[PDB]
């Protein structure tokens, strides 16, 4: 048959490699749809036919669970990640530490801070939480360059349309055109976690085979290579 995976945008590269490998060794076609975790959860709620859902936060998985769209016994935290600040590869921007007294205004210099839309994209929600805890939010809000998902934010920095952008550590590994210039302290935000679950009514042997593969060694190898931490 064919499996349909709805996965957070930050999983783009890893999921494509995993799908390729699974087809080589098991013969099944895996089709992935990538977007903000919020967008995917709402599509699943509406009735879009996804078999698996992997969210970049617990919030949007909880959302789908409440709408009775998830086979709950299958829900499990699969990956972890870090929150970082990236700059264009060829930028002269130097490394910096992030604390209560970081001078964001000087760092930006009339430029905007690329972020996933803090209204709903997990990467933006983690970022807003961190910036509010570090007291930088009030200063930064009028200087944001929001995007549809974390990869949209990444693109803004790669195309040098924003001096800095807040993305996941894994995004930096996948990107050929940016560099990590700072890392948020773990205590500034909720732990970045990626729950996976089978969509209600799609728990059959074919989907289950893929779900099990995601927790196996071949997949763990690919996830690690892309900067994700395995839970
Ligand atoms: O759902 Mo994302 O990976 O925070 O854009």
Curated annotation (Swiss-Prot):
May be useful in radiopharmaceutical applications as an engineered disulfide bond-containing protein with increased affinity for perrhenate. May be used to remove chromate, which is toxic to many biological systems, from environmental aqueous solutions. Pfam families: SBP_bac_11. GO terms for cellular component: ATP-binding cassette (ABC) transporter complex, substrate-binding subunit-containing; membrane; outer membrane-bounded periplasmic space. Keywords: Chromate resistance, Metal-binding, Molybdenum, Periplasm, Signal, Transport, Tungsten. Disruption phenotype: Cells are unable to transport molybdate unless high levels of it is supplied in the culture medium. Changing residue 37 to A: Loss of chromate removal from a buffered solution. The gene is modA. This is Molybdate-binding protein ModA. Part of the ABC transporter complex ModABC involved in the transport of molybdenum into the cell. Binds molybdate with high affinity in vitro and with a similar affinity in vivo. Binds tungstate with high affinity in vitro. Binds unnatural anion perrhenate with high affinity in vitro. Does not bind sulfate, phosphate, arsenate, selenate, chlorate, metavanadate, nitrate, perchlorate, permanganate or carbonate. One of its GO terms (biological process) is response to chromate. The complex is composed of two ATP-binding proteins (ModC), two transmembrane proteins (ModB) and a solute-binding protein (ModA). Induction: Expression is up-regulated by molybdate limitation. Repressed by molybdate-bound ModE. NCBIfam families: modA, PRK10677.1. The keyword Mitochondrion does not apply. InterPro entries: ModA, ModA/WtpA. Molybdate binds at residues 10, 37, 123, 150, 168. Its main location: periplasm. It is found in: Periplasm. One of its GO terms (molecular function) is ABC-type molybdate transporter activity.
